[PDB]
Amino acid sequence: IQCSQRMLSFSDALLSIIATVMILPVTHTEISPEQQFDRSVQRLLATRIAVYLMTFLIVTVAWAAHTRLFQVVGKTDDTLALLNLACMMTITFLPYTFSLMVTFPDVPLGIFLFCVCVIAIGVVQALIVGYAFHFPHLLSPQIQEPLSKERVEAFSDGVYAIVATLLILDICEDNVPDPKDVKERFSGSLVAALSATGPRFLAYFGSFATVGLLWFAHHSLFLHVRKATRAMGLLNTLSLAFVGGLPLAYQQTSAFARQPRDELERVRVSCTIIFLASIFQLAMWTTALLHQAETLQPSVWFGGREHVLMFAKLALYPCASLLAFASTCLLSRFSVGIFHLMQIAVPCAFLLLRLLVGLALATLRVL
């Protein structure tokens, strides 16, 4: 009989990979230069987005069920590890089957495959439960609503890492100049061929910075969380789902724009995605504040030392996104520059957040 922590961490990593499988088609969608094709291209992209959102949810539900199952099976053994591997393997087919079901609505085989995968997941989990109850010493002591904060943190960390490294993975695969290309299409200059790839690196820069800072806020919040809840888990799931869309937004804000309005609308979309990703972290914090006695450490309670700093940390990005979005409507001519200035400023504000909070508190105290 063994401790289950490493096995559950491995399962969380696998589930995080599977939950994000359908983002690659979205980011690998090519921004066509011909605007006349837009109507078609958009129709594809939106669909690819919708599927991504559904899959991430469905897998999340499975993950949640897993998190509950092994709250009832505390200690693991060899048989349970092998069975959990089987369960992970079954879960890995959910995205493909759902994608096939949506791609072939009128073919009854797609729904059959998806339902059979769901049934197989259920069967393996029931086998795990039966095995653990046949050997009672593998059950949790209380067996012989809250979600395990451990699993939430691990799953979120995996999702954040994948989303932060998506664009660098794509660059490392696709954008190493061909030695022959550097000759004819760049007159032998590796400098020029690399410079012709600047926009993609700027996109990776922006995406990694934003995802890392959102992870930083999430990490700061869950460092103070005594107990996670189902509502908090749902809000975290929504936040991660919208975090997945940040690399796309940053790709679109570095591409070439024939018309300024395209730049403006891409900025709008980017700010909207950032706001959606961050407002649900803030909602997580606010919902936890409803039951701070049970969910939060005293430090972040109302009147605590770290309450205001935590609120500022979790409300920074939403406020910045809202300000940029409002500028796009009221200060259009400067909106793109404001967006870039925000991309530079927000990391600096996170760096100097404590001093800024103290300064604001003192200023309001004297005022």
Place this chain on the structure above:
Amino acid sequence: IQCSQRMLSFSDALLSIIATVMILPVTHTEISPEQQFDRSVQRLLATRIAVYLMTFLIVTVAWAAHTRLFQVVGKTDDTLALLNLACMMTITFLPYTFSLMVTFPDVPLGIFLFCVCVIAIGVVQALIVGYAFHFPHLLSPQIQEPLSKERVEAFSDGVYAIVATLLILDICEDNVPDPKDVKERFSGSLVAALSATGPRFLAYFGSFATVGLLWFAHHSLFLHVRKATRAMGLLNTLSLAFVGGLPLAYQQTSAFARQPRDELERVRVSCTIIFLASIFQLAMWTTALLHQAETLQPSVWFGGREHVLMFAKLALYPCASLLAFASTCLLSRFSVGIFHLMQIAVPCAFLLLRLLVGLALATLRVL
């Protein structure tokens, strides 16, 4: 001031993603149907393999340094988390710069970029050290050879998950039938279009099973490890590097073969990769046995309860690979069938390993 466990887990996940970036070009290499191109294609593939092996090592070294740095910085704070994010960002560019250096040997800019990335990593880590020494309370208590088993386990888990899900990621991106294709090239049968994708799913099946069982052996070993060492870390790095090549081997053993000798040689390669991945886990165990008093729990000491079972668990796959490799030379006509029978048997042996070990021990006792 904060506990550093979640930040280090996040860093391990990022580093595991970066260490495996250069495997995607290897697995995305297309098995050409024209044998006359082989000489060229092989030359590419081997090169893509070599780079993958170098990058995985270089990143590993960085990871190792990281693991040491935060053995000296025990507790973290906001500034250190942001600095660690900067360090991760710097590390993410090592694969691209090394690939560019190897792709353009005669251009001095590639070596310059790679060296500058290394220098930037060093600079950020020195900044972390200086900050932690300016605030002594962030240092480890012993500051105010062994590698952290925590980091080794997390890094290995991430690598294993990525390698296990590579092929399903590729399938989910590429191999959902086009609705138009199902019409003309398959006469409207979704069943037939899915069946024409069977080999890839068999490859994923095989790869996931093998990677999961290797992870199972690694997990069983490190459940009994009191202290990890530098030599053990090097052997684990080698094992993970050769684990990365299993999806390729399983792709090659499901592709079409005009000549039986191609099948035989692909089987040889697959068995060799499995043997290389597993023999280093066994070497890890054997090296730990040199200092069991310091590195291992009593259960797995010589004469302990779990010594023989652990040895069998870590020597199963190497023995099976060796047997299949020998069959390919002595029982060529049956070698492919023996390979498939082994792919079925090894999971069953892991499932019934305890009973088989007991049976063998009793049989030798009576004999």
